[PDB]
Amino acid sequence: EEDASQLIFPKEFETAETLLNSEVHMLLEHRKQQNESAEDEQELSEVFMKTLNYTARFSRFKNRETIASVRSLLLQKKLHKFELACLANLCPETAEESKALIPSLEGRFEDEELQQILDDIQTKRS
Amino acid sequence: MFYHISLEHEILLHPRYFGPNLLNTVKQKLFTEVEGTCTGKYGFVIAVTTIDNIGAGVIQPGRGFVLYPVKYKAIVFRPFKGEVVDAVVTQVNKVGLFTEIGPMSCFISRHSIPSEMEFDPNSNPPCYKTMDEDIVIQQDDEIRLKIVGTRVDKNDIFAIGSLMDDYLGLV
Amino acid sequence: XXXXXXXXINFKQAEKMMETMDQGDVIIRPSSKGENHLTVTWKVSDGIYQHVDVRATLWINSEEFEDLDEIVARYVQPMASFARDLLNHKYYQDCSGGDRKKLEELLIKTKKEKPTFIPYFICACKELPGKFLLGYQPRGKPRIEYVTVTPEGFRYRGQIFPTVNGLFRWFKDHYQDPV
Amino acid sequence: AGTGCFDLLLDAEKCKYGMEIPGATPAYGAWSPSVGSGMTPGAAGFSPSAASD
Amino acid sequence: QANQKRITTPYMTKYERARVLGTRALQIAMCAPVMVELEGETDPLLIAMKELKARKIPIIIRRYLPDGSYEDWGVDELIISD
Amino acid sequence: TPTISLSRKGPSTIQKIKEALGFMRNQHFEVPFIAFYRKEYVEPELHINDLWRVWQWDEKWTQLRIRKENLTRLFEKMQAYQYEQISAIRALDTTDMERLKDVQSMDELKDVYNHFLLYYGRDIPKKFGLTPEQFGENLRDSYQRHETEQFPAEPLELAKDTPEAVLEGARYMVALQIAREPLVRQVLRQTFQERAKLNITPTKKGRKDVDEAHYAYSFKYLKNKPVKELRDDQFLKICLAEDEGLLTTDISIDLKGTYFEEIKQFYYRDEFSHQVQEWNRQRTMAIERALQQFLYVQMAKELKNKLLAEA
C-alpha cells in the first residue's frame, strides 16, 4: 500500500519533518564537532562516515541560511511535506523532469509556477 | 529520505552505574544503543539529535536493573517504493551495478537498465555505455535512480532501484 | 612557590610526605573512593591537611580532569591564600588543632585578666580542615562560631567575604549584637 | 497485596550523593558547621571597626 | 498527582518498609554506591537499614490510588515508623 | 621508465616484434613455437618472456584500437550533429581526429574525450580571458607568448552580462575549461610522473598500530623515498596501501613548494593600471582554482595509480 506516487505513508511515520542533504550535512557536522571534542567518547560509526561523505558530495548549497530560505519559500506555496526535501535534493531543471521524477506534482500545479519554483531553487544553488 | 523524528526506547541499567552521575550514563547508553542501529520499520537511524525526555525509571521487582523510558529526537533514513534519489556507484559488473545511498547499498540489474547501456568489460575501468558511447557510467560515478524495492536483512536494510524510467541517468 | 606533586602510595604516606612540604603545596593522587577519580591534598596549616574529593568535594566535568594545574590554580591556591590570611592574623592561636575546650579556656583566662577588653581568637580545625574556630567571650560565657574557607573567600554566618579585613570588620561590627 | 500494592522508582537526584568504597578518608569541607545559639540580652564593651584598605 | 495534592499518609507502611529495604540491599549487593559512610559492616541488608535510618535511600515510591492516579513519595519525604 | 631490452636493439626489436606479430596473428602461432622454430626472426634466445610481453602489448593495442574506433564513430556522429547545430563561443568538432591520430596516451585521450563531451553538453536530439588551447602552447614551451583578453572591462562589467550580481560566475567556466584542457595533462604529466620522493611517516595513532610491521613506521623521521624504491622495492607501495586499508597513512612528495609558482608567472599580466590587472588577478585565482581541481585531484591519483601498477 506504501507508494511514493500515491502519498501513502505509515501512520506512525506520517508526522515526520523531512530534512535536506545539506541540512543533514550541517546536523552530522555539528554532531561530529561534538564528538571530536569532549573525549573518552566512542568513535563514530561506519554509517556516520558513509552518510557524512555521501551528504557532503550531494550537498546542493553550503550556506546555512539558504536552507531556511529555500524551505520557507517552497513551504509558503501549498505542497505536501514529503515533496519539499526531495525537490530541493534532486534539484530538477525543467518542470517536465520535475513531474517525471516526482509524479505527484504532475497535475498539482501549472507549468509556469512549477518552473518558477525550480528556477528559484537553481538560483539559490551555491 | 531523511526525517527528524521522536522515538521511545528503554535501557536497563546495572546498579553500579548509579554513581554520582546517572543521567549522563543514560545518555551514553542510549547513544551506543541506537546510534548506527537499523530497523526495517523506521528505516536506518543515522544519528541521535537531542534527547526529548528521560522518564521516571522503574525499579524492577526482584532484579537490580532499572529501566528508564526515553524520548529522543533522532534523524532516520528510510527508502520508499517509488522514491528517486541520487546515488554513488561502487562497482560495475556483468551481473549489475552496485550503488551506495548513504548507509544503504542497492543494486541495479542489467534487465531493468535500458537496452542502450551495453557492457564494456574490456574498458580499462569496467563500464556501461551507449552505442554512441555518450553516457558513460563507471565506478565513482554519480547517477540518478528510483528505489523500487526494500529488503531488511539481519535488521539491516538493503534496496533495489531501477534506472528504466525517464530522466534517470548519470548526473 | 606552591609546588605540586603527582602520584602515579596511599593516604598515610601521603600525609607523611605533606609533613615535609610547605603550606599550599599540593599532592594530586588517585582517590580511594572511586576508580578514575582523584584526591587533591593540600596543606591548610601545620599538620592540618584538606583532602579534596574531585568528582571536601569539587565537581568538574570529564574534560577538566586533563588539566589539573588549572584546577589547582583556580581553586586550591586562593584557599591557600585565605588560609595564610587567617594564619598571619594577630590573634591566631593553635589551641591543640582547633580544640574547642582549649579555646574556651584561653578566652576565659584572657577575659579574667582584662575585663573591659574582650579577647577573640581564631584556630585551624584539625578535624575540619578548611574550617576555623572563631571564639569570643562577650560576657561571663565564651562563644565559638565557624569560618569556612572557600575559593571565593570567607563564609561566615552564610555570608561570603573576599578579604580578611572585610571578614573581621563585619565581625567587629556584629560581634556586639544582643542575640 | 502489600509488597506489591505499590511500585518503586529510582530517584536519580538523590543518586548524586554517595560514593563507592573498596573510603576511610573523611570528606573535610563537606560537613555542616552549625553555629551555637547565643541567648543573652546584655550590654556592650567591645572593639571598633578598621578600614578595608 | 501534584505535590499539593498528597492525600495519602505521611507514614511509611510496613510493606513499603520491607520492600524498600529488600530492593535497596539487592542493589548494594550488585555494587551500587552506598549513600552512607559505613562503619566496616559487610552485610548489605544492614547497610540498607543504616541508609534507611540515615534517610538517604535514593528510591521513591509510587502509591497507586484506586481511581487510577498515583502519588510519588520520596523515602526522605515520609516518616519511618521504627 | 625501466627501459627493457637495452641485447636486442631498437630497430631489431621493432623487426622482431613485427615478425612475432606476423607469426602470431597471421599464422595462428604461439609464443614457444615462434620462439623455438622462428628463432632467427626473433632475438637469438636472449629472452622467451619478452614475447609474452609483446603478446600482452598486442592485446592492449587491440583493446585500444577497438576503443579508438568506437570513439571515432562517436566523433563522426557528434561531428554531423555539430554541423546540424552550426547550420541552424560554442562546441567545435576537431578533437576526435586528434584522438584518432594519437594512440599511445589512451588514458589521457579518454580524459580529454570526457572534457570534449562535456564541452558539447550531452545534447542528443537525434568572454573569459585567453583560450586554454593557447595556454597549452604557452605552459608547454615554459614561457608565455599571449595574454588573457585585453579589454578595459572589469568584473563589474561581467556581473551584468547575470541575475545574481556575482563577480565570479565566469570562474566556474574558467575552472571547467582549465580542467578540460588536454594539453595541460601532457604538460603537467611526465614531470610529476618522472619524480617521486615520498615522505614516509605515519599518523599519531599510526605510530602505535604498525609496531615494526609495515614500511609506514619503518621510517618516521626520514623521507624522500625515490622512485627506484617506490617501483623496484614496491613493497612500500603495498604496505602503505594496506595502511590505506588500515587507520591512516601520509601520502606526499613535498616537491611542489618551486613547481607551480613558476606556472603562476605564466598568464601573469604586465599591466598594473587595473585595466588588465583584473585579468591578472582573476586569472591567477582561476588558475589556483583549476590547480585545486588538477594538482589536488589528478596528480596524486595518477601517482598512486602508477605506483600501484608498478607495485
Automatic annotation (TrEMBL), chain A:
Keyword terms of this UniProt record: DNA-directed RNA polymerase, Nucleus, Transcription
Residue ranges of every copy of the RNA polymerase Rpb4/RPC9 core domain listed in the record: 11-126
Subcellular location as annotated: Nucleus
Cellular component GO terms held in the UniProt record: cytosol; nuclear speck; RNA polymerase II, core complex
Entry's Gene Ontology BP terms: transcription initiation at RNA polymerase II promoter
GO molecular function terms listed in the Swiss-Prot or TrEMBL record: nucleotide binding; translation initiation factor binding
Function: Core component of RNA polymerase II (Pol II), a DNA-dependent RNA polymerase which synthesizes mRNA precursors and many functional non-coding RNAs using the four ribonucleoside triphosphates as substrates. Pol II is the central component of the basal RNA polymerase II transcription machinery. It is composed of mobile elements that move relative to each other. POLR2D/RPB4 is part of a subcomplex with POLR2G/RPB7 that binds to a pocket formed by POLR2A/RPB1, POLR2B/RPB2 and POLR2F/RPABC2 at the base of the clamp element.
Family: Belongs to the eukaryotic RPB4 RNA polymerase subunit family.
Protein name (record): DNA-directed RNA polymerase II subunit RPB4
Species annotation: Sus scrofa (Pig)
Organismal lineage: Eukaryota, Metazoa, Chordata, Craniata, Vertebrata
Covered residues, full protein: 56 to 181 of 184
From TrEMBL, chain E:
Tagged with keyword Nucleus: yes
Source superkingdom: Eukaryota
Compartment(s) where it occurs, according to its Swiss-Prot or TrEMBL record: Nucleus
Record's keyword terms, sorted: DNA-directed RNA polymerase, Nucleus, Transcription
Record-level GO cellular component terms: fibrillar center; RNA polymerase I complex; RNA polymerase II, core complex; RNA polymerase III complex
Main location: nucleus
Entry's Gene Ontology BP terms: transcription by RNA polymerase I; transcription by RNA polymerase II; tRNA transcription by RNA polymerase III
Example of a GO MF term: DNA binding
Family: Belongs to the archaeal Rpo6/eukaryotic RPB6 RNA polymerase subunit family.
Function, in words: DNA-dependent RNA polymerase catalyzes the transcription of DNA into RNA using the four ribonucleoside triphosphates as substrates. Common component of RNA polymerases I, II, and III which synthesize ribosomal RNA precursors, mRNA precursors and many functional non-coding RNAs, and small RNAs, such as 5S rRNA and tRNAs, respectively. Pol II is the central component of the basal RNA polymerase II transcription machinery. Pols are composed of mobile elements that move relative to each other.
Name of the molecule in the record: DNA-directed RNA polymerases I, II, and III subunit RPABC2
Gene source species: Sus scrofa (Pig)
Lineage per the UniProt record: Eukaryota, Metazoa, Chordata, Craniata, Vertebrata
The encoding gene: POLR2F
Full protein: residues contained: 46 to 127 of 127
